[PDB]
Structures are given as structure tokens and as C-alpha cells.
Amino acid sequence: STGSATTTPIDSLDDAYITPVQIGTPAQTLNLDFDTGSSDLWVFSSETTASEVDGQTIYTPSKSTTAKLLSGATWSISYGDGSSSSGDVYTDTVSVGGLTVTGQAVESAKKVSSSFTEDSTIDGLLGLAFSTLNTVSPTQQKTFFDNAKASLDSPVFTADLGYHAPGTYNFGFIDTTAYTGSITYTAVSTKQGFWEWTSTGYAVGSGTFKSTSIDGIADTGTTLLYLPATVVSAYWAQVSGAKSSSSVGGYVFPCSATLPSFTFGVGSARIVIPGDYIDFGPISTGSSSCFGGIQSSAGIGINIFGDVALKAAFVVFNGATTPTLGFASK
Ligand code: NA
């Protein structure tokens, strides 16, 4: 089997992407944030504290003839941005882009943190990291990918995120029309439960490529590119008037600037992030200070190849016995 679903930016900045997901019988379609940096499929629901719901579509398990309470199971998750959610668990039928899993753990939120409530466009998350990170207790649950895997034509999924445009998540096949050149595959460590890999270096604009190992994770659920402070300083030094602002919480730059590109290495291959991808717009409405899309990972304890990086590539998440990542230009 295969599946193919379109993913759509939630706003003009590509702050996140949402993908429609069918849950239950009859289907309830929720728009979920596919997150290769976590392993829980959780949803706003009929159980979510009413004051914490503001415009999201909810899953109502009592209206699904295939929903079953997973007795005694609870979940609770905290993300890198400080947000969190928790609740109880149902199993139900979940379909993505025509690919169906029966008996998927659907984590129903009783509580969500303010950043979730305030984002009316995201109805929950669908985790695509390794199932070792799933938070369900006392019986850990499998991701949608892990439950689908054995049925797929190939044990893979691909992320093809758009710049200010829709893109695609495919399950079970490579769309050879969706990228240019060849796919470069690189090793993955699953030791932290992430799609963790090592970039071979970087370049700023038309500058020379610096060969250096950068360990980090491919994380579709993170907006920005978080890299070591040395790399990030080297990038923003090429933008007149850019500075790190402790008050704003990262590098800012004059909105009048034209940003240089950023290249990262994948083995001997190179992915180029156009400068425009690095502009996250005014820090507050009407400001002439703009927020940068490349930020320091110092204090986060891992480098994160978030959407700024991934949307410059066609990315293969290869879930074979030994997982690997693939990157192609597009
Ligand atoms: Na921000």
C-alpha cells in the first residue's frame, strides 16, 4: 500500500504545515502537524478542557463506531518550545492520503498548553519519530508509520515541504518526479529516538564550503534551522545590521536586507537554502526588525534541521531495518 497527502502552511511565514487526517468511522478529518521530531499522535477532542479549545476541529470518539478506549492508558508530552499536552487514549482507524491503519493509538487531549489553544489551525500532532519516544503509559504505543510499515510497498515516507506553498507527504514510495538529480542517503542514529544524522558542513552565500560534522535531527515539527553558534554567527555576519537580540530571543536583521543563501552538506552533496527562506518577517507587526530563520542551538542541546532546511529538499525517511535519511534538491 501507499498514501499521499498534501501538506499546507498554516500562515504566510510557513510557521508550520498541516495535513488532513481521517480518524474514526465515519471519518472525522482533523488537520494535524506531522512531526518527525516526536512520536505521539494526539488530537484536540471532545475531552479537551472547553476553555483550551479556540477554533480547532475536535475528535469525538463517542461518534466513531471503531473507537475503543485503551483502558488505563494516559499520555503527557512536553515539546522543545515549552508547549505541552496530555490526556487518555483510544484506538481507532486512521487514514492519511488513502493509507489506512486500524488499531492506531489516538491520544485524546484533556489538557493543552496556551500555544496550542492560540493556534486555531492545528488540530493535533502526528508523530513520525521512532516509537521509543511515544509517551503512552503504561503500554507504549506505535506511530502511524510504524503501524503502517509492514503493509507499505517500501518502508519509507517522504517530506516535500513547500516554500510559501503546499507540499506533500508520501508513504510507501518515492516519487521520482518530485526532485532533481539524485537522492543522497546518510546514516541515522536512533539512539535518542530521532531521525538524527550528521551534516558534512556548510557555506554562507557564495562563500567557500566549510567541511565540519554537524550532528542534528530532521524535524518537520520545528519551524527554524538551529545550528551551532559558530555557524549561525558566520551566517549573520554577512547581513549588515544583523544582531542577536536577547530581548527578542534570537538573531534579527533589518527588514530592508537581502539575505544570503545557506548551504548544508549531505555526504558529498549540497542542499542550498535560498536567502528568502530565512526571512521570518517583522518581529512585531509594523516593525522594521525582522526575525531570522537560522538561530543558535546553544542551550537546546541538539541541532535541529527544521522546516527552513527541510523545505529546500526532498527528504526520504527510510524506515528499513537500518534506518537512513535521503536528501535531494528539487
Ligand atoms: Na517566534
Side-chain angles (χ1 to χ4, degrees), residues 13 236 239-242 244-257 259 278-293 295:
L13 295 181
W236 288 110
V239 180
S240 186
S244 182
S245 172
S246 54
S247 53
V248 173
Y251 281 88
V252 297
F253 67 93
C255 297
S256 58
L259 296 178
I278 299 162
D279 178 9
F280 280 74
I283 58 170
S284 298
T285 309
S287 180
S288 70
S289 182
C290 276
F291 196 66
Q295 296 294 346

Side-chain angles (χ1 to χ4, degrees), residues 3-7 19 34 128 157-161 167-171 220:
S4 181
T6 298
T7 194
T19 309
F34 283 23
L128 293 168
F157 68 90
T158 65
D160 181 8
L161 302 180
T168 307
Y169 284 101
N170 290 329
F171 294 81
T220 57

Side-chain angles (χ1 to χ4, degrees), residues 62 64-67 69-109 112-141 143-148 150-190 192-242 244-265:
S62 64
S64 174
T65 56
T66 41
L69 179 73
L70 184 63
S71 185
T74 63
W75 65 279
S76 182
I77 194 163
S78 304
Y79 297 104
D81 65 355
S83 67
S84 62
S85 55
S86 63
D88 62 9
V89 187
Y90 294 79
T91 57
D92 209 342
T93 301
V94 172
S95 301
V96 176
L99 170 66
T100 301
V101 167
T102 60
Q104 175 62 48
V106 177
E107 302 173 33
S108 166
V112 302
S113 66
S114 62
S115 58
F116 289 115
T117 299
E118 290 163 1
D119 183 4
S120 62
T121 70
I122 290 177
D123 304 323
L125 268 66
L126 188 149
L128 293 168
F130 293 87
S131 293
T132 58
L133 296 179
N134 176 266
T135 78
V136 178
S137 179
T139 306
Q140 187 172 62
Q141 301 294 304
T143 71
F144 174 82
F145 177 56
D146 207 350
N147 282 322
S151 304
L152 296 177
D153 290 357
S154 184
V156 304
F157 68 90
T158 65
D160 181 8
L161 302 180
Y163 168 66
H164 294 178
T168 307
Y169 284 101
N170 290 329
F171 294 81
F173 70 108
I174 308 305
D175 180 353
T176 63
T177 74
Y179 60 86
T180 63
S182 53
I183 306 177
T184 299
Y185 289 86
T186 198
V188 164
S189 174
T190 66
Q192 298 191 82
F194 300 122
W195 292 93
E196 187 171 4
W197 66 289
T198 303
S199 172
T200 53
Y202 69 97
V204 175
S206 59
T208 61
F209 184 84
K210 176 73 164 178
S211 290
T212 186
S213 295
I214 304 174
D215 291 350
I217 65 167
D219 184 0
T220 57
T222 293
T223 316
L224 306 186
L225 174 53
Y226 295 88
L227 291 174
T230 48
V231 176
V232 172
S233 181
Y235 178 79
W236 288 110
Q238 297 304 310
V239 180
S240 186
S244 182
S245 172
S246 54
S247 53
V248 173
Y251 281 88
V252 297
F253 67 93
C255 297
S256 58
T258 306
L259 296 178
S261 65
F262 185 89
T263 301
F264 63 94

